[PDB]
Amino acid sequence: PQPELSFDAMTIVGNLNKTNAKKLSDFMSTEPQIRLWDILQTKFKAKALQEKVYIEYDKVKADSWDRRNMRVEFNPNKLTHEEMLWLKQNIIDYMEDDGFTRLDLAFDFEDDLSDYYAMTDKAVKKTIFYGRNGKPETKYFGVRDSDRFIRIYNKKQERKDNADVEVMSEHLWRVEIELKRDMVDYWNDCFNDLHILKPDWSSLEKVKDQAMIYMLIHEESTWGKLERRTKNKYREMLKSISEIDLTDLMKLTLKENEKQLQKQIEFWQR
Amino acid sequence: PQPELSFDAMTIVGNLNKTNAKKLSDFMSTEPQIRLWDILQTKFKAKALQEKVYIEYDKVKADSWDRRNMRVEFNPNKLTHEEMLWLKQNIIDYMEDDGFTRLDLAFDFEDDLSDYYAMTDKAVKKTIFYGRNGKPETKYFGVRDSDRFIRIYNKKQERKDNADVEVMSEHLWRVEIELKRDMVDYWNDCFNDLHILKPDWSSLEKVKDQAMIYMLIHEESTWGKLERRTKNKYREMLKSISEIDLTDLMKLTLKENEKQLQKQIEFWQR
């Protein structure tokens, strides 16, 4: 099946006037439905819309690193058009120099992705979190502080664990691609380095089968131990087997929704 | 070789008199070499001995929730006996209802553990950090917020990275066992489910067996694919195949030093 694609995180960074800092800082105090803390003249923190939007202004720490001075963080999937409108008009518009610092692509699949893994053509570090059952629930590829980082994890299990409403499907895995800094401008075709795979052996139904192959694939000597009637069974099986690459479906769904997603971005920049 | 064993973290929780709170609060203000903050009559925070001991008193929280009102945190390995003496006499003695809330066992080995297979018989979450190499570097069994949590990792590499004094040995790996809450009283046998092995699948004369193992020891996920009754068969087999199990050396060193360590604890309680 084709995976559903959406943006799942947007950070927007800008710069805010001395005038506007106060103005905005003043505005927000008057609204009890927004929560303010860690206030000074150069600093302000806030969550808005039932805690769905984080907002941080810091002048003293913006300039100390020569950067822009205000972040706004939120998940667009969790905002209602009304809300999106509210946030743009009452916050984003008063920012200048504004662009995207973070942007996350979320591909939901109704298959089981436990055995899938990402590779860039560059050699990267991996982390896998296994459940009590011994199965893998979350996978990290690369590092979170970088232009591109990929999670592959059991959304169903994670939603269940998060006490979210239960879901009709028997399997649900996400592939999140966190694009930061300069990579955000390439979101619309990011897959040149990257492939999301599942091995040869993984595709078999039978644990003993998949072990036996894996061994044959990794220790040449293993053929020498095996009887001829057996050798043929596994020669058959080897040829019968292909590695799977979801990349292609992803690129497809991406292309299919490029224009909507693109508009959905442009919304914030006007 | 036998691994050196030591405690690598202690917290101690207690209650402090109105009289002693002040007495102690008074004492600390006079000493410039201790850093005091967040002070009231019912509150204080402090770091002492060149920032190596954290100390926190809160009465109003303690009254608000029916709890003990003071914690003292430190690593005993990083204290000099002189220092240990100072802390007991000038702080701990003045506590009552005092016991241990955290206790960490650190087994250092001069072998390379990369080449062992580490496993718990118990069903708990595993985290494995893989290197760019594809091989596993660090393993966590359990979660940090729990009665018992285990790290296995390259101490030499971690010490080097930490700009610590270099070490004569070519290899140095730690096995840290963080015991919290009620588990602290069972420090003398907290790792019996844990096994660290060196199996050679080859010596199994049956061939599906050897594949299955080889896979288990090279793809952690494949435990997830085994029904519960099967997992035990292969756990049996693993242990049955390895001449070496470092667990045994740990249990030994532990027994050998149980009495000293025990005294080293009793030191704090008098």
Residue numbers in the entry:
A (entry chain C), B (entry chain A): 39 to 308
According to the publication:
In Gram-positive organisms, the smaller plasmids often replicate via a rolling circle mechanism, a process mediated by a multi-functional replication initiation protein (Rep) encoded on that plasmid. The Rep proteins possess two related catalytic activities, a type-I topoisomerase-like cleavage activity in which they form a nick in the (+) strand at the origin of replication to initiate DNA synthesis, and a religation activity to join the ends of the parental strand that is displaced during replication. Despite low overall sequence identity, there is a high degree of structural conservation between the catalytic domains of the Rep proteins from these Geobacillus stearothermophilus and Staphylococcus aureus plasmids. Structure-based sequence alignment reveals the conserved residues are almost exclusively located in the β-strands containing the Rep_trans motifs, and it is likely the crescent-shaped catalytic domain represents the canonical fold for the Rep_trans protein family.
In this report we describe the structure determination of the core domain of replication initiator protein of cryptic plasmid pSTK1 (25,26) from Geobacillus stearothermophilus (RepSTK1 residues 1–269 (27), hereafter referred to as RepSTK1). This was then used to aid the structure solution of two staphylococcal Rep variants, RepDE and RepDN (containing the 21 kDa fragment of RepD fused to the 14 kDa fragment of RepE or RepN, respectively). Constructs of RepDE and RepDN spanning residues 35–314 were used for crystallisation studies, since the first 34 amino acids are predicted to be disordered and had previously been shown to be dispensable for protein function. RepDE crystallized in space group C2, but all attempts to generate experimental phases were unsuccessful. Crystals of both RepDE and RepDN contain two molecules per asymmetric unit as a non-crystallographic dimer and the final structural model spans residues 39–308 for all subunits. The catalytic residues of RepDE are found in the crescent shaped domain, within a 10-stranded β-sheet, the outer surface of which is decorated with 7 α-helices. In this protein the catalytic domains do not form a closed ring, but rather a ‘horseshoe’ where they are rotated by 15° relative to their position in RepSTK1. RepDE and RepDN also contain an additional all-helical domain (helices α6–α9, residues 237–280) previously identified to contain the residues responsible for recognition of the ICRIII sequence at the origin of replication, conferring specificity between the protein and its plasmid substrate. Comparison of the active sites of RepDE and RepSTK1 show that they are remarkably similar and can be superposed with an r.m.s.d. of 0.4 Å between the Cα positions of the catalytic residues. Mapping these residues onto the RepDE structure identifies a potential interaction interface for PcrA helicase, at the open end of the catalytic domain.
